[model samples]
Target: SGVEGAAFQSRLPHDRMTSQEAACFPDIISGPQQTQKVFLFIRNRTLQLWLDNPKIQLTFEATLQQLEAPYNSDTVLVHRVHSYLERHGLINFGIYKRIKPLPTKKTGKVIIIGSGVSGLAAARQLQSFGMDVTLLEARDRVGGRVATFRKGNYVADLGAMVVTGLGGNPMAVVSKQVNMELAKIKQKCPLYEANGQAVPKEKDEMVEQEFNRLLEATSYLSHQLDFNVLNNKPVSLGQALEVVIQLQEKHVKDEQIEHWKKIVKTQEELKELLNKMVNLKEKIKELHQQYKEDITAEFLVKSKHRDLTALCKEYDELAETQGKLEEKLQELEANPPSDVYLSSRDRQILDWHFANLEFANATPLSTLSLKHWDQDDDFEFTGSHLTVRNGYSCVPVALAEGLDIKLNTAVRQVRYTASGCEVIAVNTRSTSQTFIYKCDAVLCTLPLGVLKQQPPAVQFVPPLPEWKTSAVQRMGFGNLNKVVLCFDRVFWDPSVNLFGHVGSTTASRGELFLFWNLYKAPILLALVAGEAAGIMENISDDVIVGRCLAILKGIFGSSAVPQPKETVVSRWRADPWARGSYSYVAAGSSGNDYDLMAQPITPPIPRLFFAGEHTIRNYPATVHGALLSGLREAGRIADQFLG
Candidate 1:
């Protein structure tokens, strides 16, 4: 009976005097000496009323009249008392409390679980449709993974960084409606280093061009392998080399030949020609050093030399260099750089020299399409100004403001049927009482991981379809960790848009590693995606901090790498509420799984609906997308009710 004892003791008081009674006469037995005695009587009366009727509705007008009885036209006092009572839930006369569920012709009520961006959007949409809707949130606050952390005067978005596809993205549209700005991220190509040498951005381009050229030079070798070029017999490696040599000799002009001659004469000159290549190798080594404890040296070696060696090295070392230069010249002929990269400060100097080289006689290597390379006229770099100024968590704040949200309430079970759904939620406040809310339908917006943990415990009258269950199983979630470093001084030049490096093959699992400078702020944000994120999450902060510092030291020199004033890193994978940052399709999974998740169950469960990032395919795991999805569902419900 301890449970009952707890419940019984938690009830509010009753029999308090109406505000009218207290205001009518200031003192019942009053003189200066009797003032204290009179106040005690009023206090007891108020407590008695609270105990007698805790759920009694107190109207704004009624409360106002009562408080204004002794005083004339003091509207502000009445307003303050009314506001206080409404806010504290002492009087059930607020907008949310006053708005009762609309009666539905359908058999049961609709319930929505979770209050993240998705859940909130869905609930708001359904509410607009005039459907009897109730939303259940496990956490005290909403906006699950879309969180923002505040440090001093600055607010950092710890999760959900950007609106990727701006033009047609649903989130983009909603952001426009909400008057939120969208910042264009013009990230620069990553700087690379190899063998204790820094690869300037220009060198990176040259290496790529040279690598492409080598691939082309070897294309002639492929022709020889066709048997027709070699008179139907397997040719020796020497024969293949001769074919490549002849093709380069016959087609390459004297000017191009002169350039290749400079490249192969010495390793140091080769280093100068393929400076980016050396830097690429050095960066790979740096990555290997930084992640040495976690990754094997063999892995790094294989990723770098072994992987690209076949493409770069076809013949003897000298022949290979010559072949690469020929192939690279061909590539430049076939696909020219867009005017943007050609004019950019990063590549302009190299572009000028490359343009002057006569490559008409050389075989063309690769072609590059220049579509979408130029920025749109309307595109403006707003930096982080377009971000949710109040914090990305404003999504939750806006949804909770006018809603009947019960903070600290947790759901134990959600049972659904053809007629409707019932939620058995436990209030974790003063008393742990179980509340069974039987509604026509229930919309569950719980995270996939949470659902998995509690699914067996939830009793669905008619279980979800096998196909839906399978989709949930196949859907994969990934971790994306962010390390934000704040410094006392800005080390990078403001004119330099971005100063960073793409993780070499050894550094990333074939994915790019990124670091960006926040405009005008002494802050740098590093992004680790895919498997690297998982690796970082498992390591200690000291190790990560050290690795980050090492990278800065390599790029900006030991002097530029000052100790940061503050550092913050996030590992979303470890959070139970959010098992991972966002849902991603694994190798075998497709867009169909997202469709399956959003698909509505049959008519008997008309009241039930699903919404959130996972359910949305176009803009899954984004704030604007979540908002649109919720609005879409709400619109659907509204049409059903109103029509």
Candidate 2:
């Protein structure tokens, strides 16, 4: 083992390759350069006393200076010491089989702020690579927002519920190591309304199909020869909806009106049709509502009257002529080349499409960037969203094993020093007492919501550059809240995986879009997103529980829907540590926004680096994203300082 370790050390970073090379890179001076080679001397000395080691200590600063050490310079090193440990049969942890390890360990130090997915991943990986690391957590637990609530032995997720993607997601490796069982939440088969009426399958399926088609059209327009649209101007999804509505309205010509008047059976029916056309805005909302609310077998049959049939036919024919009409429209004004043709079915689908976007983003559709919609290259665990049976928090908790994690130690200040960097913190359990730490590097994985705080929960001494702060202001930090209701017995069908409740009307949009029966438990978890989630943040938990119960009654059509024995509500929007949920590319921003945020505070010897879901690109608002971010920053530090 000693021979192999020495051999591997020879293959590690050749920091002394050029005697003429300066140790300074931008702000990175010749920090600890002279003492770096002392590490080699220390290794030789330690070999002489292999069987004489006993006491452990954190007094690294003076100890290393008394001997040999390493320096900080061009950090691009990705130390994989764990792989070597496994290969040499020195240890087994069922982890990191793919990564090839560099045998010898470098003596260095790092401080990871926040014990969320990113912090834990980075800290654990760095520790495996033999870097002395400390993880500072503001909370009393390790899982950050990936919290779980257990009723005696019955576990339920109160925070993060989904293990989203699998392909290339680092969590998959850990999940297997921890023996985590994953379950998927398949969508509702026959969508229902908020009022508990079944929305016909015909309309429900069409709505979904149209939603995907519209998004496809927008994707086509997202990038072209030079990333410019050929036909249509870049606009928000909401703007595109307006164009679609106006285009559809144009096809409802006066000739169709004349035919409708002549063919409608009763004078009263004709009058109602005229009145609908007189107020098209409300009429559009109503049509969407009707489809959601009891668009029953009778409604469809009754709507086949001659007058209604003519109007539908008009829409049907025009949709078929979409290509030609688009070509003509482009010749006049070709801003975004991509196009969508709406049928009578399309209008309702578009409405649902808008709703889905808002819910998915936890923000209004108007705030989402059309150019970046669905552009994320995130691959899920076989496209089946997995919910850990034990709890989502288990990943971070498991990863945190054998690590120095200080719970209830909220970091208040981070400042850089020549000896390295230092962090000031207060024991949240006792705010009056303060503690400080000095380390060679720091990995910051603060949530965007916390980063956006006016004074900021944690302040950087020299302050981040204008570019980073500016991007933070523009990036979307929206809310997605949930209210959990546990019943004495299940009322919704036992086999039903999910229940969707489309609003009977779009007065302010539906607050509760869907609810899930967690693996047939007595628990009913209701999701609230966008503006509604924000509004719910202000209301009390009792009010939230009531609203959820009311919707349950409306869907089940039971006046005596039993009240729950337990009601759990999440207020991510109001959580002082997390002002809101995750992030999205705001309407005015693009992928560059993520890039801007992810950049280190400074180049080369950047004492502080950031990680977290929002700090990473292509995978914001994901646990896997945070894990990957930690790995990325650790690898970067190795490269910068080691090599």
Candidate 3:
């Protein structure tokens, strides 16, 4: 049979039509001719020759050659040809025959969901154990929460800021393993200001002496009020002072009574002295306000020396007060009160006294004490400090070094069967291509937010335990936000250390108060914790800018405060993926959940396990903790598999 030939037509105009010409112009038609030839071969050899022909069969041979090229090259050419045919108005390629799918190999596999510090650590450990591990990351890149973003010349830590108690921290150890540097941050407290004036820094010795004198006086008064000393008689602080006065007049030795009398007078003077103490709170507020308001680079530079000095001074005072209080309390313990009152009011006062004592005793004596405050008995970092720098990428990098990571793969369901766990995951971009991976066990490290939502995105075969479900529901997430402001100038006084500002104007007061400062790189950062963080998250960026500007204008005066050159704010609460910054223990939640979360999925699984910051009991909600948990998990797995 003869091959059918098709006629061709051209639409291009050969001549322009005048107004008198007909609206429908004559269409030009080309000859009906065959552009391509088809040949039928009876034998295999004839068919091969026809496919290899150069002219009439060149199109077919070229197609064969393209199909025979390397897979990558063939793929590129197929796309190129597809685009070319489409551009030239040729018929599109129809659906082709489906090839038989390759059978999937089953093994003892463990799946880790996140790429954060905790997730990475878990994967590293499981892999070392010789367990077939698969890391499923939702994001394009790993390192959840330990990320650092570069903006021009400076690199900002979008998630964690610092690694606290780094000396012997496991993360530090790992960092060393990876040849990363750990820089010691200088210990400095923010300055305090009062009524627009910088508060002068008191000598450590002077503050200590005064604080001790006050404690001794308060203790003497406490003793007189003790019902035991008065044969079960309860008395107020004022009444106790009266009793001490009478005792001095009666039989006490001059040495014992002399200090007691001075102390009694000081007690009377405390109303004023106490005001001074309260002023410290205000001073701190002022300092915070100043930093928030005057973020100009020049202002920061000018204020740097004073701010650092003030911070150092406060740290010293805290240290001194702590020492003196401990000494005084120990000395007074020898002469215990005969009886203690149990009335609500008296009990409240007693509680206050005990709390103050604890505070003083807990304060470290020097910078050394502060530095090693969270060290374990073995001098290892116990994961006390949790600061994110440059976001959360640090975690992913530490975990993903040489692992087989699958990206853009969203797991849809996981079912534990008689043989093993069957995992169904789909390529987000291609719904038709479904992947089934079989593993002995699976370790899920997703955030509670995801676990709680129960989105159709993921399904569990045999549901988790009731307690586990309840624990996930009960966990509290803190809404925290932070803003970093860069300035063009700094204007703080060097000699006048410690400037703090207050936001309480007979109206607002309490923990939710919104400002704190650090003079690092001519940048001042403001922190919003708890409900305030949530409130800030709902507001627009412009509104936040205006609110911050107004607060500064109120404190520093519009004239002195320069507009910030750059402002960066993060609303962790608003992120659907994160929901909140860190998990917090509420009033009724026990510490058991931490342990439960760390427990490994049962055996026969061979390789599934869990590890993260939250899994570490001693140091939860910290990068170092996450790292340590990871290392430990890795070792355990390595011992099981590699050994």
Candidate 4:
């Protein structure tokens, strides 16, 4: 209508120009000083005109001109120097429209199940879009796997302990807002042999370098393979590592044969060095006995009054000699001669490395898909891993603020059609009480493990499609549990962040291999992953604590290690709500499964959506991954309504 442009007409200089024409003139003189580009609307299309120092405004009629012969349809760079244009403004050719008198879309209601990080994330995001969001949580509290166990001054993480990566992590912002104390985890993890001896620093470095090279080869092969082909059976991660290790072994054996003579010579030197230290230690004990006898004899001479000043000199000489011998003994023990290592020791180191990988993924390497195991490596979070001193639960707690979250509201079934969704939930405190919520959409953030249960915990009224069901079953949901032992004092090395214990065999590698020390705390956090973690679910906490104590005793002798006064053991596998800790790429499944699970169910329109760590391909098994997935789904749902 002309009424829309009536107010803008008086601002124009020419009488013949309409307000629409005036708006499209590019406002030549007024642009450069105030802004770089002038926005013009022509034929209801938006165009950007870069304003340069033109000599004067062109007295040209505004008209559409079309030539048929040839045209510069492709993007051409128009330099704006001697050509009389200042700079080129970014041009985006697209349709434009003004806001309507009123919103065409209604305030849709969304019910988000599971008030974990993902659920809380979606709730807050959709709420911002003017959608009525309600979050339902099965647990009595929030922050699913980010659970923090707090007692007086003693605080330990029962779930996630560290922020996997600090670079560009969304949690960084949330943590700062809450004024959280984030400390970088030190990279030093001292490796200890099963026999209670520390692995020499030189030997540890050689094997670690070898293990890293094998991993680089594994990554290269994963990129080269085509995992999408239907009939192609991809190798498991474990198999790929074995293949690489085998190839490297044959080459190493050849070198070992050539250096056999040197190896023997080095072995003899190491043996002699070890014997010298042992003999020095024996001599120090004998000297201590001699000092005791000499002191007693001096006292006897003093009683006889046989030159007291001379006896005092003798005593001083004896003490000085004893101190010199002790200092020499320490020097011998501190440094050991380097020696050629056997392949068996190297394999143990590799096993320890493999166990650490499993702890990160919460799944055994044998079960991980070779092609998609480390699919997120390219986007891996850079910077040091961080631990929140206050605990990781702080992030989720902050997110849950002002959110309409209903704790202990376990959802039973979700019935959805083209129009809307009906969520049936029962109150956990009182089983008899059930509530049914009707919403335009339902965002389910249940952990993958819970979804994979045989008689599924949460039922779909019409049943989920074949693709989502397959993704749930094919993708891996593995166990990772923590046994936090708060001791009376710290016996392990206080300087390092971690203490690594090599297991006797491959089967026992993941048992109690990694112990995380919280710097000053008199506590040791032991990570149990893969099969060991699953087995721990059925065992008693005391039994696991005892097993851990045994391992610690070996690393730092029985006398130094003390019994823990308090302990916290996580049984994620046995928890009905979580069933398992997190997700991984299973042997038969690929990263495509993550995308499939993320695909919202649509009967021509989105009525159901999924969000959690499992749905995110690049960042699975992480808190930030779960948070990002929630934001992704909220955007998708918001797009449907905004349009």
TM-score of each: 0.53, 0.69, 0.51, 0.70
Model 2 stretches astray by more than 4 angstroms: 1-106, 220-234, 253-353, 377-382
Better of 1 and 3 by TM-score: 1
Residue 2 lDDT in candidate 1: 23
Could you tell me the lDDT of residue 367 within candidate 3?
Answer: 13
lDDT of 2 at 537: 74
Sort every candidate by TM-score, greatest first. Answer: 4, 2, 1, 3
Give lDDT tens digits, candidate 2, residues 298-355: 7664664544456655554445554454454444343322244455334543454466
Clashes of each: 35, 26, 61, 0
lDDT of 3 by residue, 8-44 (tens): 0011111222221121111211222120111110111
lDDT per residue as tens, model 1, 1-643: 3222212222222233345334533353234535434333333322233323333344445444443233325455455444433332233311122334444543225677777777776665455334556677666677777776667755556676566454323343345333444455554445544212445656666645743463345544444444223344333322333355455445445546555555455445445646655655564555445443425767766665554554344323445565676676565555533323222333332221221110110100111001110112133222232434345664566555555566566777766665656788876564467788887656767665554444352445567778887888766555677787778787765544454444443334212144656434576777666446666787777777777877777777778889977777887777666766766544335567767887767544365566776776654555655655565555445444443
RMSD of 2: 18.1
Q: Number of clashing pairs, model 3?
A: 61
Q: What is the lDDT of residue 85 in candidate 4?
A: 13
**Candidate lDDT values, in order:** 0.51, 0.64, 0.46, 0.70
Greater-lDDT candidate between 1 and 4: 4
Name the best candidate (by lDDT).
4
Q: After superposing candidate 1, which stretches have Cα over 4 Å from the reference? A: 1-109, 176-181, 194-198, 206-390, 426-435, 452-462, 495-498, 502-512, 519-521, 639-642
lDDT of 4 by residue, 107-147 (tens): 98899999998888777667645578899998999999889
Decoy 2 TM-score against native: 0.69
Tell me how far the alpha carbon of residue 394 in candidate 1 is from the true structure, in angstroms, after superposition: 3.4
